[PDB]
């Protein structure tokens, strides 16, 4: 046996709980992106001391 | 069950599966990037705005440090 697969049914819930899956992995994803923005300019390290000037 | 049947592999069509969430996030990954990204868009228009109108109005504006006009004083002349 090879080519064939006699699961011919490709069952979608499977499917569909991967896919669910990808809405909690579409959501970490969007924040560890919006982290890797985000987290830029919560400078904490003390940086522009008074009004922006030298 | 057992992580799937077991005579099968379920990891060929797992496979497929798991592509799907990892493209739904790479899709939905570009919108939220232009969130980020275009937040700033318009300072950094607004910033680089501000520089080419502060030249143009101030490389050639000296009228102002005079006082707030130059010509048109026509009146009783002399030197």
């Known amino acids: 046996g090879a080519m064939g697969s006699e699961e011919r049914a490709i ?3 499977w499917v569909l709980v991967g896919v669910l899956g990808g809405l909690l992995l579409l959501t970490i994803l969007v924040l560890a992106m919006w982290k890797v923005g985000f987290f830029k300019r919560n400078r904490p390290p003390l940086e522009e ?3 922006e000037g030298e | 069950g057992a992580m799937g049947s077991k005579g099968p592999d379920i990891l ?3 496979l497929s599966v798991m592509g799907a969430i990892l493209l739904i996030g790479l899709a939905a ?3 939220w990037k232009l969130l980020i990204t275009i937040h700033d868009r318009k300072e950094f228009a607004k910033f680089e705005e501000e520089r080419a109108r502060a030249k143009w109005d101030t490389a050639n504006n000296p009228l102002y440090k005079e006082a707030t006009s130059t010509f ?3 009146t009783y002349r002399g030197t």
Request: net charge negative; no cysteine; aromatic share 6%.
């Open chain 1, 11 to 13: 069952p979608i819930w």
């Open chain 1, 49 to 51: 001391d008074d009004e």
């Open chain 2, 12 to 14: 060929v069509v797992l």
């Open chain 2, 29 to 31: 990954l570009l919108i």
């Open chain 2, 72 to 74: 048109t004083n026509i």
